Amino acid sequence: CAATISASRAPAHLGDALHDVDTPALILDLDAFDRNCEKLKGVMAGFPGVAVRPHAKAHKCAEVARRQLQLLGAKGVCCQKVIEAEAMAEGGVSDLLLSNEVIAPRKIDRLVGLAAAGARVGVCYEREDNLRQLNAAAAARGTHLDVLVELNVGQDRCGVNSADEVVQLARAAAGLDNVRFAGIQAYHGGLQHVRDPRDRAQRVGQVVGRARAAVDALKAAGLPCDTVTGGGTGTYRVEAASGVFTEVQPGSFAFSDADYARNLQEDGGVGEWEQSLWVLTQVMSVTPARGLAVVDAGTKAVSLDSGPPRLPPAFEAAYGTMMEYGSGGDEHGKLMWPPMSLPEVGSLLLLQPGHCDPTVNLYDWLVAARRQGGQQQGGVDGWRVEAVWPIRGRGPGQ
Amino acid sequence: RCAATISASRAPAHLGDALHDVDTPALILDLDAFDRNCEKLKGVMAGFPGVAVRPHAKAHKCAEVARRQLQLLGAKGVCCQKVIEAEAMAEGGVSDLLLSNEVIAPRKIDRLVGLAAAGARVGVCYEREDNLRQLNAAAAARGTHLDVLVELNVGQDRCGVNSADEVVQLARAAAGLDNVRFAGIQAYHGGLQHVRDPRDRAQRVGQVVGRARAAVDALKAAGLPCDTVTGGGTGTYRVEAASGVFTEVQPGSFAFSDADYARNLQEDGGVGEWEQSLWVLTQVMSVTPARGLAVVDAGTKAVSLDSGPPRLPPAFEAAYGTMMEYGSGGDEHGKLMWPLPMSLPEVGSLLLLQPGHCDPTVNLYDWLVAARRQQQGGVDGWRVEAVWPIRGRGPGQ
Ligand SMILES: [Mg+2]
Ligand SMILES: [Mg+2]
């Protein structure tokens, strides 16, 4: 049936412990996940009139989105590609912003088909021809699409480069029947991992001004700007505070990773969010003559795209020192001591991803689990698998 | 409910399609270039009689690929890095498998032994007697046998034993077990595969050869055979095969190549031994002139940057004037940037990217689009010959 053995066979079932989970595996600690959702909601209470639209590109899993929305009291999600919107819609997550341009006719048709199915769909554009084909596909299916102009605010990825260009494209949307100009996306991904809280706030300030210049130009032209969306896990505090942005788009907040753990903040604190996402891995080789324990999770089980994964504080407990992860290639991870007990062969360990989203995308299933509380984070003892969820939006980005 | 994943339930193309019919980003295999690499390897190997090719299936994770490789090579079997790749090979009729790594989880052993019991010829590596004993135990339980090879560390410092004495003892341990058979050794140095000059590659593999020969000779002094001496890869295989010590070479990437392997200097004076047959098909979904930028839909999730950026082919330079450079645009965007009369690809246009590293990129896809261009790069004159499930894709179970 399925294209891969992995996507036909779950690594665990309801009621398993971590020792029953086939490795490498992706683990979600629901307790820490719930707490991160709780924390975001509590921070956002301080900014009323600003919506949270959690980014589904982090987890690609409909059951995750449903729980986020329930806990957040939020209405909808973001998807980067049509396939994620397809994953959300089939799992009954029906309020969607495609926070990116979609130019391929067959992908537009899939997105429009969801709006036809009853879903509330937004999509970003930066080009009139793209707007026109968006409108056409929508018209063919007897449905409508919210459309938002993407503005480049300094990330230099996609989007327009002037307030004038925003106006022109909003002007173009006005005269089309199955499309409604709904505002702007202003996302600067390059500011998300700015370490210094004052430097980060200063840089977001510039993004805020660029967004304001766009809202004001539209107002000058007699056009509305009902939604101003953007920001992420790193910057959302500053975008929410601005009075310019109406919606924030954090995705990583719920899971954290070793990159986001390094973000210093206004108070005495390094890293805003509890690590809820882990790669479970088994030690399959030990060589005490070197510094070495080799685990079964390599490149293909943990993305190194933002640096190595990290061993948690519980590892340092009852091993003595904290050993480091280096690549051993596709299917090996090297754990090296910079003397006491190395982990035994057959022993399990939890690895914090260096970067959450790409790591999640290596897996076909998410193992959702809870441990029994008052425990040091990242030990493999006393977990119970609450659920095993298909990651329906996994793939290269259709 | 077909698959855990929409992508693993829905093929990106069908038989007869041109590349413009292929949903992006996609993994394309040029069968013409693939056959030529398989033809070339075979030709070289004809110069080294007695040495068998066991191509590494971890490169492609696809049964239909292994099947074509073995027929083109006249070879008998493949390597698998994890049991999942072995399952995927065995369900697709590839019946002679070496697990070129250690397997310690009992549930994984049962799967592997399951294949042997179903009729597959299975070999597996080890470095520990306790692991050897579980291998034997599971094999006995299903009424089957396993070939077992002692892995030796020969410079890579990954896994394996670090002395010939260790080899002897482990072999002696296998010698007195009923459902296990000491087949010899694996001596693989992955660190030398991308050594650039053939001289340095001959000099450093020669040291690997000496370490391997020491193990064979120590075994012979102990009155035990070393039937199989397996190792080497796409970079080093010629020296391993030339040595008179190795009985088997393990190249995987050769059939596909990548931007990394393309840069290895060869004896004949050529840079890159293999033709690029493996591509990431991508679509320009955004253009910004005077940023000099065309953004493609293939990001981190479609092309691994683990060993370097993907490269545009010579056909791109021929069409647009100059060669653009790929930079990361995050998860779902690839940035193509100018290093001249400014001419960028249009929005909607299709482009082929040579992966920086072939295996991790392959493992991002659920399907392989097998195609032929009528008689480089260029997206113009292709027909899809077959769309094959990559049944071994995953974290490595
Ligand atoms: Mg991310
Ligand atoms: Mg490789």
Tab-separated table of C-alpha atoms in Angstrom, chain B residues 6-356:
chain	number	residue	atom	x	y	z
B	6	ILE	CA	0.293	11.899	2.144
B	7	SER	CA	3.513	11.929	0.054
B	8	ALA	CA	4.005	8.164	0.715
B	9	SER	CA	0.421	7.547	-0.487
B	10	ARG	CA	0.587	9.812	-3.571
B	11	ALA	CA	3.166	9.401	-6.371
B	12	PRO	CA	4.534	12.687	-7.851
B	13	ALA	CA	4.280	11.394	-11.447
B	14	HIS	CA	3.051	8.528	-13.639
B	15	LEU	CA	4.290	6.474	-16.624
B	16	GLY	CA	4.606	8.560	-19.793
B	17	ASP	CA	4.918	11.946	-18.032
B	18	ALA	CA	7.342	14.642	-19.129
B	19	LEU	CA	9.253	16.413	-16.349
B	20	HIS	CA	6.730	19.294	-16.575
B	21	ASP	CA	4.075	16.781	-15.358
B	22	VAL	CA	6.110	15.915	-12.249
B	23	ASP	CA	4.983	17.413	-8.930
B	24	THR	CA	7.853	19.311	-7.268
B	25	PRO	CA	10.154	18.923	-5.525
B	26	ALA	CA	10.880	15.433	-6.907
B	27	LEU	CA	13.714	12.927	-7.035
B	28	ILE	CA	14.597	12.030	-10.625
B	29	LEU	CA	16.910	9.228	-11.817
B	30	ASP	CA	18.344	9.479	-15.311
B	31	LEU	CA	18.384	5.779	-16.292
B	32	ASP	CA	20.679	6.495	-19.307
B	33	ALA	CA	23.408	8.026	-17.101
B	34	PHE	CA	22.722	5.384	-14.366
B	35	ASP	CA	23.266	2.514	-16.863
B	36	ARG	CA	26.496	4.204	-18.053
B	37	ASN	CA	27.884	4.415	-14.485
B	38	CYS	CA	26.932	0.759	-13.942
B	39	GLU	CA	28.618	-0.103	-17.255
B	40	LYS	CA	31.768	1.846	-16.296
B	41	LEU	CA	32.169	0.267	-12.842
B	42	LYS	CA	31.795	-3.208	-14.433
B	43	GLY	CA	34.488	-2.382	-17.045
B	44	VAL	CA	36.984	-1.223	-14.399
B	45	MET	CA	36.215	-4.311	-12.250
B	46	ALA	CA	36.965	-6.578	-15.225
B	47	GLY	CA	40.563	-5.378	-14.680
B	48	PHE	CA	40.485	-6.755	-11.108
B	49	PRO	CA	39.492	-10.450	-11.451
B	50	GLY	CA	38.463	-12.273	-8.267
B	51	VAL	CA	36.987	-9.106	-6.661
B	52	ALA	CA	33.177	-8.951	-6.459
B	53	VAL	CA	31.041	-5.788	-6.403
B	54	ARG	CA	28.454	-5.578	-3.650
B	55	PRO	CA	26.852	-2.174	-4.311
B	56	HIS	CA	25.512	-0.285	-1.301
B	57	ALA	CA	21.709	-0.056	-1.265
B	58	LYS	CA	21.748	2.719	1.417
B	59	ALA	CA	22.434	5.072	-1.485
B	60	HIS	CA	19.010	4.469	-3.075
B	61	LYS	CA	16.828	2.404	-0.665
B	62	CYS	CA	14.840	1.096	-3.632
B	63	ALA	CA	14.433	-2.553	-4.695
B	64	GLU	CA	13.932	-1.772	-8.395
B	65	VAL	CA	17.288	0.111	-8.341
B	66	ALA	CA	19.201	-2.789	-6.720
B	67	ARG	CA	17.578	-5.194	-9.238
B	68	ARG	CA	18.802	-3.068	-12.178
B	69	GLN	CA	22.250	-2.576	-10.614
B	70	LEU	CA	22.868	-6.312	-10.176
B	71	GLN	CA	21.743	-7.161	-13.736
B	72	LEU	CA	23.936	-4.429	-15.269
B	73	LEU	CA	26.892	-5.435	-13.058
B	74	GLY	CA	26.336	-9.203	-13.306
B	75	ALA	CA	26.632	-9.084	-9.488
B	76	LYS	CA	24.904	-11.207	-6.825
B	77	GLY	CA	24.039	-8.950	-3.910
B	78	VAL	CA	23.933	-5.623	-2.112
B	79	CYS	CA	24.887	-4.010	1.216
B	80	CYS	CA	22.282	-2.612	3.647
B	81	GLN	CA	23.202	-0.253	6.517
B	82	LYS	CA	20.049	-0.950	8.571
B	83	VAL	CA	17.567	-3.881	8.748
B	84	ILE	CA	14.827	-1.741	7.135
B	85	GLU	CA	16.892	-1.501	3.901
B	86	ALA	CA	17.315	-5.305	4.051
B	87	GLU	CA	13.536	-5.821	4.401
B	88	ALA	CA	12.947	-3.469	1.442
B	89	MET	CA	15.492	-5.408	-0.668
B	90	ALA	CA	14.075	-8.842	0.270
B	91	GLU	CA	10.420	-7.924	-0.467
B	92	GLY	CA	11.607	-6.787	-3.925
B	93	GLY	CA	13.412	-10.060	-4.699
B	94	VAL	CA	16.957	-9.016	-3.843
B	95	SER	CA	17.972	-12.165	-1.940
B	96	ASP	CA	21.696	-11.868	-1.159
B	97	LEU	CA	22.246	-9.213	1.504
B	98	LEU	CA	25.085	-8.008	3.698
B	99	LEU	CA	24.099	-5.922	6.697
B	100	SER	CA	27.304	-3.832	6.583
B	101	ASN	CA	26.846	-2.673	10.221
B	102	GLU	CA	26.079	-4.055	13.739
B	103	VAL	CA	22.516	-4.788	14.821
B	104	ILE	CA	21.959	-5.087	18.633
B	105	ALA	CA	18.188	-4.623	19.151
B	106	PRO	CA	16.390	-8.007	19.471
B	107	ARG	CA	13.327	-6.831	17.472
B	108	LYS	CA	15.645	-5.788	14.600
B	109	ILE	CA	17.504	-9.185	14.755
B	110	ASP	CA	14.179	-11.060	14.393
B	111	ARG	CA	13.277	-9.064	11.261
B	112	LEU	CA	16.705	-9.766	9.678
B	113	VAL	CA	16.716	-13.491	10.634
B	114	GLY	CA	13.132	-13.519	9.301
B	115	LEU	CA	14.546	-12.771	5.837
B	116	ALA	CA	17.146	-15.570	6.095
B	117	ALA	CA	14.351	-17.959	7.158
B	118	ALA	CA	12.271	-16.840	4.148
B	119	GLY	CA	15.233	-17.841	1.926
B	120	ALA	CA	17.495	-14.779	1.705
B	121	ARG	CA	21.261	-15.188	2.014
B	122	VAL	CA	22.116	-12.845	4.906
B	123	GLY	CA	25.494	-11.578	6.122
B	124	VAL	CA	25.945	-9.284	9.148
B	125	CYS	CA	28.799	-7.505	10.971
B	126	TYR	CA	29.793	-7.777	14.656
B	127	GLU	CA	32.439	-6.620	17.164
B	128	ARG	CA	31.122	-8.298	20.372
B	129	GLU	CA	30.539	-11.910	21.501
B	130	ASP	CA	27.286	-11.115	23.335
B	131	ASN	CA	25.883	-9.637	20.073
B	132	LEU	CA	27.272	-12.672	18.227
B	133	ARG	CA	25.411	-14.967	20.645
B	134	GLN	CA	22.043	-13.208	20.161
B	135	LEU	CA	22.593	-13.361	16.358
B	136	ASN	CA	23.110	-17.126	16.671
B	137	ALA	CA	20.165	-17.538	19.092
B	138	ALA	CA	17.622	-15.811	16.805
B	139	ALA	CA	18.964	-17.673	13.741
B	140	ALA	CA	18.538	-21.027	15.548
B	141	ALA	CA	14.993	-20.096	16.652
B	142	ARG	CA	13.800	-19.721	13.051
B	143	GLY	CA	15.788	-22.717	11.704
B	144	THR	CA	18.226	-20.690	9.573
B	145	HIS	CA	21.861	-19.513	9.442
B	146	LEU	CA	23.689	-16.184	9.205
B	147	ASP	CA	27.063	-15.341	7.731
B	148	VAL	CA	28.968	-13.194	10.242
B	149	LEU	CA	31.818	-10.793	9.565
B	150	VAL	CA	34.038	-9.149	12.163
B	151	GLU	CA	34.149	-5.425	11.520
B	152	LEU	CA	37.609	-3.874	12.050
B	153	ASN	CA	38.374	-0.183	12.532
B	154	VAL	CA	40.966	0.644	9.861
B	155	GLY	CA	41.194	4.419	10.414
B	156	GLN	CA	37.616	5.763	10.351
B	157	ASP	CA	37.287	5.353	14.151
B	158	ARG	CA	33.520	4.660	13.912
B	159	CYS	CA	32.841	1.001	14.822
B	160	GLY	CA	34.878	-2.198	14.718
B	161	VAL	CA	37.691	-3.787	16.692
B	162	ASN	CA	41.148	-2.195	16.956
B	163	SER	CA	43.402	-5.304	16.914
B	164	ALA	CA	43.849	-8.591	15.032
B	165	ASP	CA	43.704	-10.475	18.382
B	166	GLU	CA	40.114	-9.213	18.834
B	167	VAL	CA	39.328	-10.456	15.284
B	168	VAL	CA	40.758	-13.931	16.102
B	169	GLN	CA	38.841	-14.314	19.393
B	170	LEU	CA	35.490	-13.241	17.874
B	171	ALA	CA	36.046	-15.587	14.924
B	172	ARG	CA	36.949	-18.400	17.365
B	173	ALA	CA	33.654	-17.650	19.147
B	174	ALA	CA	31.669	-17.837	15.870
B	175	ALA	CA	33.608	-21.032	14.980
B	176	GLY	CA	31.915	-23.003	17.793
B	177	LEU	CA	28.314	-21.884	17.169
B	178	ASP	CA	25.780	-23.901	15.138
B	179	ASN	CA	23.709	-21.289	13.219
B	180	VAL	CA	26.489	-18.765	12.598
B	181	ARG	CA	29.433	-18.985	10.138
B	182	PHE	CA	32.544	-16.820	10.295
B	183	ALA	CA	32.714	-15.356	6.801
B	184	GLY	CA	35.670	-12.994	7.336
B	185	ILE	CA	35.999	-9.241	7.851
B	186	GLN	CA	34.691	-5.774	6.986
B	187	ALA	CA	37.397	-3.112	6.776
B	188	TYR	CA	35.819	0.147	5.665
B	189	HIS	CA	37.374	3.614	5.882
B	190	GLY	CA	34.664	6.186	5.050
B	191	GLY	CA	37.077	9.051	5.791
B	192	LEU	CA	39.130	8.368	2.634
B	193	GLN	CA	36.287	8.335	0.078
B	194	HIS	CA	36.619	12.048	-0.708
B	195	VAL	CA	40.431	12.301	-0.614
B	196	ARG	CA	40.940	14.284	-3.828
B	197	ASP	CA	44.143	13.090	-5.568
B	198	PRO	CA	44.568	9.420	-6.676
B	199	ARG	CA	48.111	9.290	-5.140
B	200	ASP	CA	46.999	10.358	-1.618
B	201	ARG	CA	44.021	8.032	-2.017
B	202	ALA	CA	46.373	5.165	-2.985
B	203	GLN	CA	48.755	6.036	-0.101
B	204	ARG	CA	46.084	6.144	2.618
B	205	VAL	CA	44.088	3.128	1.361
B	206	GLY	CA	47.399	1.189	1.210
B	207	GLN	CA	47.613	1.695	4.993
B	208	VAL	CA	44.014	0.348	5.265
B	209	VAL	CA	45.148	-2.596	3.076
B	210	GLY	CA	48.014	-3.332	5.527
B	211	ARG	CA	45.670	-3.258	8.552
B	212	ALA	CA	43.217	-5.597	6.768
B	213	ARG	CA	45.985	-8.003	5.674
B	214	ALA	CA	47.260	-8.142	9.287
B	215	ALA	CA	43.801	-9.389	10.337
B	216	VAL	CA	43.712	-12.061	7.571
B	217	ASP	CA	47.239	-13.271	8.464
B	218	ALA	CA	46.517	-13.397	12.199
B	219	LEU	CA	43.428	-15.538	11.420
B	220	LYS	CA	45.500	-17.839	9.168
B	221	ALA	CA	48.095	-18.232	11.965
B	222	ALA	CA	45.177	-19.283	14.230
B	223	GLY	CA	44.021	-21.881	11.669
B	224	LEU	CA	40.858	-19.969	10.805
B	225	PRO	CA	39.817	-18.821	7.304
B	226	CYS	CA	39.129	-15.250	6.180
B	227	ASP	CA	36.899	-16.009	3.165
B	228	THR	CA	35.518	-12.484	2.613
B	229	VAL	CA	37.491	-9.220	2.984
B	230	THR	CA	34.897	-6.555	2.221
B	231	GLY	CA	35.166	-2.766	2.208
B	232	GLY	CA	35.916	0.368	0.225
B	233	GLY	CA	33.479	2.716	-1.470
B	234	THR	CA	32.844	4.906	-4.527
B	235	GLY	CA	36.039	6.900	-3.844
B	236	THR	CA	38.578	4.188	-2.959
B	237	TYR	CA	37.333	0.939	-4.611
B	238	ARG	CA	40.063	0.840	-7.324
B	239	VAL	CA	42.859	0.601	-4.712
B	240	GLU	CA	40.930	-1.908	-2.554
B	241	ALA	CA	40.275	-4.060	-5.674
B	242	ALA	CA	43.927	-3.689	-6.808
B	243	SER	CA	45.294	-4.765	-3.401
B	244	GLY	CA	44.988	-8.571	-3.657
B	245	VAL	CA	43.653	-8.503	-0.060
B	246	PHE	CA	40.035	-7.423	-0.532
B	247	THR	CA	37.628	-9.960	-2.033
B	248	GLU	CA	34.720	-7.470	-2.273
B	249	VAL	CA	34.159	-3.725	-2.786
B	250	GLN	CA	31.140	-1.806	-1.437
B	251	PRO	CA	30.513	1.282	-3.635
B	252	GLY	CA	27.071	2.873	-3.374
B	253	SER	CA	27.175	6.461	-4.659
B	254	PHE	CA	28.908	5.554	-7.982
B	255	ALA	CA	25.626	4.974	-9.854
B	256	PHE	CA	24.313	8.424	-8.958
B	257	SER	CA	27.235	10.740	-8.068
B	258	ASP	CA	26.877	14.095	-6.266
B	259	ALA	CA	28.702	17.453	-6.179
B	260	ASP	CA	31.138	16.047	-3.575
B	261	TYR	CA	32.142	12.889	-5.525
B	262	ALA	CA	32.354	14.906	-8.782
B	263	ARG	CA	35.544	16.562	-7.478
B	264	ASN	CA	37.734	13.436	-6.942
B	265	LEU	CA	40.651	13.504	-9.422
B	266	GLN	CA	41.157	10.250	-11.366
B	267	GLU	CA	44.149	8.328	-12.787
B	268	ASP	CA	43.237	9.334	-16.373
B	269	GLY	CA	43.452	13.057	-15.433
B	270	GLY	CA	39.668	13.472	-15.176
B	271	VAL	CA	37.827	15.280	-12.388
B	272	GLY	CA	34.869	13.124	-11.301
B	273	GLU	CA	34.613	9.450	-12.242
B	274	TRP	CA	30.813	9.231	-12.561
B	275	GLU	CA	28.075	10.966	-14.551
B	276	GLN	CA	25.401	12.685	-12.472
B	277	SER	CA	22.243	10.556	-12.830
B	278	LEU	CA	20.387	11.713	-9.683
B	279	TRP	CA	18.605	15.073	-9.594
B	280	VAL	CA	16.255	17.162	-7.477
B	281	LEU	CA	13.660	18.596	-9.856
B	282	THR	CA	12.618	22.027	-8.574
B	283	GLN	CA	10.355	24.929	-9.583
B	284	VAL	CA	11.152	28.636	-9.485
B	285	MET	CA	8.321	30.026	-7.374
B	286	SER	CA	9.708	33.563	-6.948
B	287	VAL	CA	12.020	35.985	-8.797
B	288	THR	CA	13.657	39.224	-7.597
B	289	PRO	CA	15.874	40.998	-10.232
B	290	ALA	CA	18.537	43.392	-8.827
B	291	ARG	CA	18.638	41.072	-5.844
B	292	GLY	CA	19.787	38.696	-8.636
B	293	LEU	CA	17.560	36.052	-7.100
B	294	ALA	CA	15.329	33.189	-8.203
B	295	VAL	CA	13.743	31.287	-5.291
B	296	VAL	CA	12.946	27.587	-5.892
B	297	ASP	CA	10.484	25.328	-4.004
B	298	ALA	CA	13.269	22.900	-2.895
B	299	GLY	CA	14.581	23.837	0.564
B	300	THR	CA	16.124	21.905	3.497
B	301	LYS	CA	13.297	19.344	3.288
B	302	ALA	CA	14.002	18.567	-0.426
B	303	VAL	CA	17.823	18.742	-0.660
B	304	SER	CA	20.318	17.935	2.108
B	305	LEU	CA	23.073	20.534	2.584
B	306	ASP	CA	25.003	18.240	4.931
B	307	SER	CA	28.116	18.025	2.712
B	308	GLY	CA	27.661	21.196	0.611
B	309	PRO	CA	25.144	23.094	-1.570
B	310	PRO	CA	23.467	21.463	-4.555
B	311	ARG	CA	24.824	22.482	-7.971
B	312	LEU	CA	23.195	23.609	-11.191
B	313	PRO	CA	24.286	21.659	-14.303
B	314	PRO	CA	26.200	23.022	-17.392
B	315	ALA	CA	22.831	23.154	-19.316
B	316	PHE	CA	21.733	25.965	-16.956
B	317	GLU	CA	24.832	28.043	-17.854
B	318	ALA	CA	24.213	27.342	-21.579
B	319	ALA	CA	20.628	28.693	-21.345
B	320	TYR	CA	20.900	31.682	-18.953
B	321	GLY	CA	24.517	32.821	-19.501
B	322	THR	CA	26.114	32.254	-16.086
B	323	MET	CA	25.973	29.635	-13.308
B	324	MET	CA	23.880	30.617	-10.275
B	325	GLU	CA	24.755	29.465	-6.721
B	326	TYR	CA	22.297	27.690	-4.397
B	327	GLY	CA	21.991	28.974	-0.838
B	328	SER	CA	19.561	27.809	1.854
B	329	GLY	CA	16.251	29.667	2.060
B	330	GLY	CA	15.063	27.590	5.029
B	331	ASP	CA	12.713	24.598	5.046
B	332	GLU	CA	10.802	25.130	1.818
B	333	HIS	CA	12.786	27.665	-0.206
B	334	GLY	CA	16.038	27.421	-2.093
B	335	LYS	CA	17.852	30.629	-2.996
B	336	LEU	CA	19.581	30.817	-6.375
B	337	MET	CA	21.902	33.814	-6.493
B	338	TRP	CA	24.183	35.490	-9.041
B	339	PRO	CA	27.980	35.257	-8.499
B	340	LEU	CA	27.368	40.235	-16.770
B	341	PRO	CA	24.015	40.698	-18.627
B	342	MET	CA	21.344	39.865	-16.009
B	343	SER	CA	19.078	36.965	-17.156
B	344	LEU	CA	17.137	35.033	-14.487
B	345	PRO	CA	14.842	31.991	-14.935
B	346	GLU	CA	11.113	32.853	-15.065
B	347	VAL	CA	8.559	31.943	-12.381
B	348	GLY	CA	7.133	28.527	-13.246
B	349	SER	CA	10.346	27.303	-14.896
B	350	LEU	CA	11.794	23.890	-14.048
B	351	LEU	CA	15.390	23.221	-12.942
B	352	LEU	CA	17.588	20.222	-12.072
B	353	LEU	CA	19.860	20.294	-9.028
B	354	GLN	CA	22.844	18.004	-8.475
B	355	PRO	CA	22.700	17.138	-4.736
B	356	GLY	CA	25.728	18.052	-2.617
